[PDB]
């Protein structure tokens, strides 16, 4: 049940300076990057081409190459059209792709100065609830387009799910990898159970007294490691001289029954 995200971000500082950067995710694994400095999209996994032939890939990349240059000029040009309503600095974010189920739904969402304002839907661009009404002129201009609309429809409806089907097949063994959490303890009372190195992201961490789950356990956020594994810490508030008999228990799919138990 994997979601494929192409995340694009663009900063336009003034009329002559801008950059566009993107990264692509399949679930929580990075499949591509496209720095403003490269002419070409970079694979960050061996299987990032999916099942596309080299010729299908070059065609696709070439369309993106034309897109980046064209997008950049369009934004500059829309800024002139709306002056003095909006002005630099401008941030534009696109979040695009498809969510796969067995036997998919596509999306393309646009943010302006960090707010979601525009999506592609059906056969056209439209504003979403909360968007300022001045965006109707840009949208009418974009909807004029016909060639861009057909290409986007094809990308969303056909190219995305077909491509992701191939990616899932080619990246099977990476996507299904099991990496073991290693844990350790410390304090400041506030006791901290650290858990690091685990993949995939589903995990269970509780403080214990023997077999009794300490409901005071405050679980933190999932933090990434550089190697595409995860880090998590669970904290507990206690009285001094009460730390005897406390344990941190960790359950995770990579351990296979044998849970980790660290006694303080």
């Amino acid at each position: 049940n994997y979601t494929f995200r192409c995340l694009q971000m663009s900063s336009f500082a003034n009329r002559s300076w801008s950059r566009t950067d993107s990264v692509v995710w399949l679930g929580d694994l990075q499949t591509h990057r496209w720095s403003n400095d490269s002419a070409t999209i970079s694979f960050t996994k061996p299987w990032s081409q999916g099942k596309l032939s080299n010729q299908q890939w070059e065609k696709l990349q070439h369309m993106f190459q034309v897109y980046r240059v064209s997008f950049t000029r369009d934004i500059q040009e829309l800024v002139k059209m709306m002056s003095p309503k909006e002005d630099y600095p401008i941030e534009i974010q696109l979040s695009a792709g498809c969510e796969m189920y067995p036997g998919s739904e596509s999306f393309l969402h646009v943010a302006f100065q960090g707010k979601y304002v525009v999506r592609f839907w059906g056969t056209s661009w439209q504003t979403v609830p909360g968007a300022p009404s001045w965006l109707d002129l840009p949208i009418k201009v974009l909807n004029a387009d016909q060639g861009t609309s057909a290409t986007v429809q094809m990308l969303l409806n056909d190219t995305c799910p077909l491509f992701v089907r191939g990616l899932l097949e080619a990246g099977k063994s990476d996507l299904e990898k099991q990496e073991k959490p290693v844990a350790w303890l410390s304090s400041v009372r506030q006791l901290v159970c650290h858990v690091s190195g685990f993949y995939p992201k589903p995990v269970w961490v509780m403080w214990m007294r023997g077999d009794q789950e300490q409901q005071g356990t405050h679980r933190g956020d999932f933090l990434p490691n550089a190697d595409e594994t995860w880090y998590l810490q669970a904290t507990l508030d206690v009285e001094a001289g009460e730390e005897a008999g406390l344990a941190c228990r960790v359950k995770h799919s990579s351990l296979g029954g044998q849970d980790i138990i660290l006694y303080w």
Partner: T-cell receptor, first 113, second 111 residues
Framework: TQVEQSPQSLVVRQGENCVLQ??????????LRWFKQDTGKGLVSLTV?????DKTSNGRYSATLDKDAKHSTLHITATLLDDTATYIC?????????????FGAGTQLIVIP | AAVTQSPRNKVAVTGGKVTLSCNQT?????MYWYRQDTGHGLRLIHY???????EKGDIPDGYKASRPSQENFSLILELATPSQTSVYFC??????????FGPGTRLLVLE
């Protein structure tokens, strides 16, 4: 110059056919238009080609567009004296008003009556 | 969709002020000014996305533009030179890609 037309000029006798070429490097190439400009006067649109491989007709004028080759030809059938004019090739780089037009310098046709 | 230009023809002196006017009743947001010189295609000087807005095209030097209303777009040569001898074409359009051209204006700048 991202839009090149050939020949520069040509002289043809009334009733003969002729062919005008347009080659371009403009990117992207949304559409290509052919204009007829009489001496002194203004720009009269003859046809606009929009597809990857396109063909249009307008009376005695017919045209082709191949976007892979970045190539268009305007064919004139059975030239009349009134075809004496400059023929201009124009490539638009967007399907909207965000587009710039890229003009060729034109091909001069003279039809001998 | 019709566009008119005025004057249609003009003799001017170097260092003089020349104003070329373009009128358009189609309620088009967008207007564009070009010049046509032999051996070149039309080249874009200035354009406008609406009243109050002017933008530099490819060859704006020697020219100011003015868009006082939706209907009128003007090309102002403050200090005319012989190199501004040319045929000038105005156009307009809405959000689509078609630009509708005026009949052109011939300017000769004498020494």
């Amino acid at each position: 110059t991202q839009v090149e037309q050939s020949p520069q000029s040509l002289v043809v006798r009334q009733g003969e056919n002729c062919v005008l070429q347009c080659n371009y490097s403009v990117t992207p190439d949304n559409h290509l238009r052919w204009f007829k400009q009489d001496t002194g006067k203004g720009l009269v649109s003859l046809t606009v080609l929009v597809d990857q491989k396109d063909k249009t007709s307008n009376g005695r004028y017919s045209a082709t567009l191949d976007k892979d080759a970045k190539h268009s030809t305007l064919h004139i059938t059975a030239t009349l004296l009134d075809d004496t004019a400059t023929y201009i090739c124009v490539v638009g780089d967007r399907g909207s008003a965000l587009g710039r037009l890229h003009f060729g310098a034109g091909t001069q046709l003279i039809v001998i009556p | 969709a019709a566009v008119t230009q005025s004057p249609r023809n003009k003799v001017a002196v170097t260092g003089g002020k020349v104003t070329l006017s373009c009128n358009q009743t189609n309620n088009h947001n967008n207007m564009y000014w070009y010049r046509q010189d032999t051996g070149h295609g039309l080249r874009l000087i200035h354009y406008s996305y609406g009243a109050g807005s002017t933008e530099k095209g490819d060859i704006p030097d020697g020219y100011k533009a003015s868009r006082p209303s939706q209907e009128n777009f003007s090309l102002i040569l403050e200090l005319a030179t012989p190199s501004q001898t040319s045929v000038y074409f105005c156009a307009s359009g809405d959000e689509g890609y078609t630009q509708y051209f005026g009949p052109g204006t011939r300017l000769l700048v004498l020494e």
